[PDB]
């Protein structure tokens, strides 16, 4: 409760490749770097010598592996993986001092899944059983951790935008954030779905039916880079950001993430984005505010516009999370946000989490 020195700084990454944590699977333990992903629910690890991989799970070396004699096939818009289901013993060396028997999908075939040049070999899906594959009977890693140990049912993430950060399993570390935590209800335990109730660009409202913000869902997802916005909201958001900054002109492809843009060694024209999220109390909300620093990503002085359009709803990816300490408070069905002690900023403006605000009709903002 409160202080977890052994877990601080337990994430690494490369800009553009996500954040991963060291884990061990089997007996004797096999060390693997595993992508932290709050927008999926399978613990899926490379188990065959794909050329992009530094290492992979060799089930044959493990005395504690149990075969579930069941295959899984998992396609996405981009690519897919297939593998074999089983269970084995898992630890997190820079996490709690416990070992749990967990489901593992040993990935035996993949396309456009693994990143060439990255340092991770699997994915730790931290969301709920409802979106596990093949079906909701394949219990996720975190539910196994909680069922088999005294670890409380919550974890928190500080993603520092090369990259690093902290995954605190079982608690909150107060050194990772400043000011207060504000909480939004997890609307349904599948993804970490939340409800956005207002959006402002430099404190001007987009003024849309708030149902549009959440069409068909909004989620918090450390396994995606961009702030992704429903097409209609995305149209409104860039129209308003373009206008906000038109002191400078940029090729239009830029706004679609189709070309990059460059300077040397300009931020103050770019506006802040405020998302107000449904609060814990009736008619109460709070707001989180991000900086151009989060939505303009460095590529290597050339940046990518990292807000993009979506047909799967809003996705608050690593772009949003890197401003904030984010507490995934599963025991109470709520996600807390606070200003991260490590967020990328400047002398003028800071990322911010403020409340309470009075917002009426917040349940209308949910899509059904
Ligand atoms: C399972 C999945 C996934 C994520 C990544 N993520 C990354 O490669 C990555 C790269 C950079 C950053 C950062 N910052 C974070 N993540 C790669 C493959 C993959 F299948 N997880 C999520 N949430 O969304 C992906 C989707 F549903 F979109 F397909 C997909 F489900
Ligand atoms: Na328990
Ligand atoms: Na603090």
From Swiss-Prot:
Active site annotation, chain numbering: 37, 221
GO CC annotations, alphabetized: axon; cell surface; dendrite; early endosome; endoplasmic reticulum lumen; endosome; endosome membrane; Golgi apparatus
Enzyme Commission designation: 3.4.23.46
Positions of glycan attachment: 97, 116, 283
Keyword Lipoprotein: yes
Result of changing residue 216 to N: Almost abolishes beta-cleaved soluble APP production
Positions of the Peptidase A1 domain: 19-338
Induction comment: Up-regulated by the Ca(2+)-regulated transcription factor NFATC4.
GO biological process: amyloid fibril formation; amyloid precursor protein catabolic process; amyloid-beta formation; amyloid-beta metabolic process; cellular response to amyloid-beta; cellular response to copper ion; cellular response to manganese ion; detection of mechanical stimulus involved in sensory perception of pain
Membrane topology, as annotated: Single-pass type I membrane protein
Catalytic activity, reaction form: Broad endopeptidase specificity. Cleaves Glu-Val-Asn-Leu-|-Asp-Ala-Glu-Phe in the Swedish variant of Alzheimer's amyloid precursor protein
Segments on the Extracellular face: 1-368
Post-translational modification (record): N-Glycosylated. Addition of a bisecting N-acetylglucosamine by MGAT3 blocks lysosomal targeting, further degradation and is required for maintaining stability under stress conditions. Acetylation by NAT8 and NAT8B is transient and deacetylation probably occurs in the Golgi. Acetylation regulates the maturation, the transport to the plasma membrane, the stability and the expression of the protein.
Enzyme class: hydrolase
Modified residues (N6-acetyllysine): 70, 207, 211, 217, 231-232, 239
Disulphide bridges: 160-342, 210-365, 262-302
Keywords annotated in UniProt: Acetylation, Aspartyl protease, Cell membrane, Cell projection, Cytoplasmic vesicle, Disulfide bond, Endoplasmic reticulum, Endosome, Glycoprotein, Golgi apparatus, Hydrolase, Isopeptide bond, Lipoprotein, Lysosome, Membrane, Palmitate, Phosphoprotein, Protease, Signal, Transmembrane, Transmembrane helix, Ubl conjugation, Zymogen
Activity regulation statement: Inhibited by RTN3 and RTN4.
Tissue note: Expressed at high levels in the brain and pancreas. In the brain, expression is highest in the substantia nigra, locus coruleus and medulla oblongata.
Location relative to the cell: Cell membrane; Golgi apparatus, trans-Golgi network; Endoplasmic reticulum; Endosome
Subunit structure as annotated in this protein's UniProt entry: Monomer. Interacts with RTN1; RTN2; RTN3 and RTN4; the interaction leads to inhibition of amyloid precursor protein processing. Interacts with SNX6. Interacts with PCSK9. Interacts with NAT8 and NAT8B. Interacts with BIN1. Interacts (via extracellular domain) with ADAM10 (via extracellular domain). Interacts with SORL1; this interaction may affect binding with APP and hence reduce APP cleavage. Interacts with NRDC AND NRG1.
Function, in words: Responsible for the proteolytic processing of the amyloid precursor protein (APP). Cleaves at the N-terminus of the A-beta peptide sequence, between residues 671 and 672 of APP, leads to the generation and extracellular release of beta-cleaved soluble APP, and a corresponding cell-associated C-terminal fragment which is later released by gamma-secretase. Cleaves CHL1.
Domain notes: DXXLL motif is required for a proper endocytosis and retrograde transport to the trans-Golgi network, as well as for regulation of lysosomal degradation.
UniProt record similarity statement: Belongs to the peptidase A1 family.
Identification of the protein by name: Beta-secretase 1
Organism name: Homo sapiens (Human)
Species classification: Eukaryota, Metazoa, Chordata, Craniata, Vertebrata
């Amino acid at each position: 409760r409160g202080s977890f020195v052994e877990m601080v700084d337990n994430l690494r990454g490369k800009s553009g490749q996500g954040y991963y944590v060291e884990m061990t699977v089997g007996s004797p333990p096999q060390t693997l770097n595993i992508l932290v992903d709050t927008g999926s629910s399978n613990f899926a690890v490379g188990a065959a010598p794909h050329p992009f991989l530094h290492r992979y799970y060799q089930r044959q070396l493990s005395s504690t592996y149990r075969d579930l004699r069941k295959g899984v096939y998992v396609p996405y818009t981009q690519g897919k993986w297939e593998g074999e289901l089983g269970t084995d013993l898992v630890s997190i060396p820079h996490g709690p001092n416990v070992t749990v028997r967990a489901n593992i999908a040993a990935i035996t075939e993949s396309d456009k899944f693994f990143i060439n040049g990255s340092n991770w070999e699997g994915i730790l899906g931290l969301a709920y059983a409802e979106i596990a594959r093949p079906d909701d009977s394949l219990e996720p890693f975190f539910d196994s951790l909680v069922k088999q140990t005294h670890v409380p049912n919550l974890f928190s993430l500080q993603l520092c935008g090369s990259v690093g950060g902290s995954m605190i399993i079982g608690g909150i570390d107060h050194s990772l954030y400043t000011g207060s935590l504000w909480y939004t209800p997890i609307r349904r335990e599948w993804y970490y779905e939340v409800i956005i109730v207002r959006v402002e660009i430099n404190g001007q409202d987009l003024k849309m039916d708030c149902k549009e913000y959440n069409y068909d869902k909004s989620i918090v997802d450390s396994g995606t880079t961009n702030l992704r916005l429903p097409k209609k909201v995305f149209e409104a958001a860039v129209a308003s950001i373009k206008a906000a900054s038109s002191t400078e002109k940029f090729p239009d492809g830029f706004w679609l993430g189709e070309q990059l843009v460059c300077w040397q060694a300009p931020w103050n024209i770019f506006p802040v984005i405020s998302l107000y999220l449904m609060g814990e109390v009736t008619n109460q909300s709070f707001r989180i505010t991000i900086l151009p620093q989060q939505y303009l990503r460095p590529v290597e002085d050339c940046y990518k516009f990292a807000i993009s359009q979506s047909s799967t709803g809003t996705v608050m990816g690593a772009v949003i999370m890197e401003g904030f300490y984010v507490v995934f408070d599963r025991a109470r069905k709520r996600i807390g946000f606070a200003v991260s002690a490590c967020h990328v900023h400047d002398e003028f403006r800071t990322a911010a989490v403020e409340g309470p605000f009075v917002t009426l009709d917040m349940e209308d903002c949910g899509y059904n």
